[PDB]
């Protein structure tokens with residue numbers, strides 16, 4: 001009767017917000033069972049969660065802190081969890097029949113690999129790791145066509161908004177990433193809303209001088225904060241929209257909505273538009289991913305629209321935010337160009353973060369790596385397709401660093 | 409297969425807008441069959457429509473122009489329609505096995521009356537007439553429980569918006585006007601948007617002396633224009649919301665949205681808000697009523713959110729717009745108080761339209777009638793209940809007139 005959940009990345013932002021909303025929903029009735037918690041290396045934080053939630057499974061990716069975890073957990077009386085580590089631990093959790101739904105709030109390799117294993121085990125995947133969809137969208141589509149009872153349910157706020165705007169009567173006849181999703185759902189176009197970031201109103205001359213300290217002074221992780229500032233975040237979310245909802249790139253419109261109340265909107269084929277709105281918020285997207293197709297009661301503050309008073313919309317300047325254009329171009333090229341976009345941006349974002357390059361150098365580097373890449377035939381074998389994605393991702397990061405080194 | 413529709417009141421505003429969107433949609437693909445057209449007395453307008461749509465049935469209410477109708481239709485070649493008159497003709501159309509959906513674009517007695525026969529024949533009724541729901545909501549609820557396959561689908565723009573925000577997998581477990589509709593749809597609260605009418609920036613002293621000319625100089629009929637100016641239209645729509653969707657009065661909030669892009673919003677139990685938006689428009693509400701639970705392609709202009717640029721929201725002042733408070737008071741009292749509100753407002757609206765009373769006298773009269781009414785035992789018998797509604801409607805109109813004459 002309870003929804004049996006695993007949280008991958010349980011000490012990160014998404015994971016901690018998921019546990020917060022689960023704790024609240026479990027106050028009176030047993031709505032969720034927290035079956036498994038996994039972290040990369042935050043052993044002390046994981047032990048504290050284990051004390052509270054007492055999951056059946058605990059897993060830590062970094063095997064150098066496996067013994068530390070086991071020793072900490074011994075102190076919990078009358079608790080004998082299955083304590084695991086590394087990729088093998090992740091696969092064991094994903095394979096458990098006692099787990100229904102998996103929240104993926106880790107990035108990078110562990111994120112893509114856990115997503116893949118969750119799908120291979122026909123789970124419901126509440127996916128918060130947009131970079132998995134960008135890097136490997138065609139591969140995830142292939143896997144979801146094999147593993148018929150698996151589903152990706154979006155958690156990224158804008159994509160949760162789009163999903164909520166749809167009619168569940170139609171959504172239940174398809175699933176995200178499936179060919180023809182937009183036709184079954186009568187989707188014409190998507191308005192993808194953005195905060196615009198901190199640099200949205202600067203002149204070109206001002207924008208040339210910005211630094212990461214300017215971008216880092218709503219509070220989020222450093223990487224995403226930089227991607228919000230360049231609007232590369234939105235570019236990555238355009239690609240994510242294309243894959244999740246089978247919407248053509250020409251039918252995805254970025255709109256800057258600085259109040260961040262409308263989270264995104266869907267235009268249907270009759271030209272009616274449905275939007276989802278709330279304060280900025282991750283509890284609603286996370287909870288909805290775990291309750292869909294139902295909703296359950298929360299104690300969140302109700303939206304006071306009269307207090308909000310004013311909502312504004314404008315189109316972003318592609319001269320000021322060239323990362324948007326690069327993402328459209330990569331997405332439209334398809335093949336492995338999104339993989340290359342993602343990987344090159346990882347390097348360029350970090351160089352800017354660390355004060356090694358200027359704002360317009362971010363897009364310069366990314367553009368040069370995209371122009372250097374040559375289309376490759378897509379492997380038919382799933383395990384070889386994954387190998388190819390990893391090869392291309394590593395090549396694109398090394399290529400970005402080579403461009404930096406040569407200019408330097 | 410095609411959507412088989414009858415239009416009641418086919419030369420009125422709703423009826424011509426219905427025929428317009430049917431015509432435009434049929435140019436894209438032929439999906440609607442107009443099976444019947446019924447008009448009050450525009451004998452030559454009905455002829456022109458029959459020429460175009462060639463329905464199986466034609467009906468005119470006024471027997472005086474009945475013969476003239478038949479004369480005109482002889483001139484259409486290879487066209488043998490069934491041509492009917494009056495209430496008898498309306499009942500014959502509603503009983504046709506050929507007709508699935510009936511648009512009610514008429515008012516008064518004939519308005520509630522045609523709605524009743526459509527329900528008794530288990531049809532889909534696209535209902536624009538809020539005064540029917542306000543005045544006779546109990547009779548309609550009872551009828552909808554006798555005739556289980558009948559459904560009312562709302563066309564009033566705000567109520568269509570609300571309905572469009574829902575997941576039809578949940579809607580299909582219930583229907584409009586059913587007890588528990590909001591609980592089954594997980595609805596917590598409604599934002600009922602309003603244009604605010606012409607008087608939001610007026611002071612109390614300015615309102616004291618406004619005239620109907622000030623109200624009548626978005627273009628609509630006189631009665632609803634005056635209701636928009638006093639915000640009694642919104643008050644009626646609050647009661648309509650309560651009946652259609654079973655939302656408690658303390659969970660319906662009126663919000664003034666002068667741009668009229670967001671047409672209304674639904675807050676679910678998780679606090680997520682979903683809204684419908686488009687240009688001001690009656691084509692989408694009418695079309696959705698006929699396509700529900702599907703959507704079809706239109707050639708309407710797409711919403712350009714960046715061009716709209718700014719949306720604003722504020723709370724209405726109850727001191728400036730006392731009709732709003734009277735509507736909530738009547739709705740919360742329940743029983744036949746809504747019937748009394750509607751009927752007394754019909755008289756007061758017309759008194760102001762004809763320069764016989766001032767703006768605050770409208771609410772004064774309505775308030776005095778409501779205070780004179782005493783709750784009635786609600787008949788369990790459907791026929792007796794309809795008689796009660798008619799008796800109370802008549803009483804309230806006469807009481808409003810009595811109050812005006814005693815002061816005058």
Ligand SMILES: O=C(CC[C@@H](c1ccccc1)P(=O)(O)O)N(O)CCCCc1ccccc1
Pocket residue numbers: 156157158193194195196197218219220224227228229231233234260280281282
């Ligand atoms: O992609 C993102 C971050 C980047 C986007 C953003 C930024 C600020 C607000 C809204 C959107 P962007 O439009 O600038 O690319 N979300 O999905 C953020 C969600 C967090 C919402 C929240 C929770 C707590 C406190 C405050 C904001």
Ligand SMILES: O=C(CC[C@@H](c1ccccc1)P(=O)(O)O)N(O)CCCCc1ccccc1
Pocket residue numbers: 564565566601602603604605626627628632635636637639641642668688689690
């Ligand atoms: O109740 C109504 C009329 C009263 C409300 C109103 C008035 C203007 C705009 C929006 C709403 P109110 O909020 O002032 O009470 N609708 O449902 C009107 C729908 C027609 C929309 C449209 C179509 C064509 C041209 C222009 C406006």
Ligand SMILES: [Ca+2]
Pocket residue numbers: 064065066067068
């Ligand atoms: Ca160690």
Ligand SMILES: [Ca+2]
Pocket residue numbers: 163164165166167168573574575
């Ligand atoms: Ca929905």
Ligand SMILES: [Ca+2]
Pocket residue numbers: 188248251
């Ligand atoms: Ca298209």
Ligand SMILES: [Mn+2]
Pocket residue numbers: 156157158237
């Ligand atoms: Mn996002």
Ligand SMILES: [Mn+2]
Pocket residue numbers: 564565566645
């Ligand atoms: Mn209305």
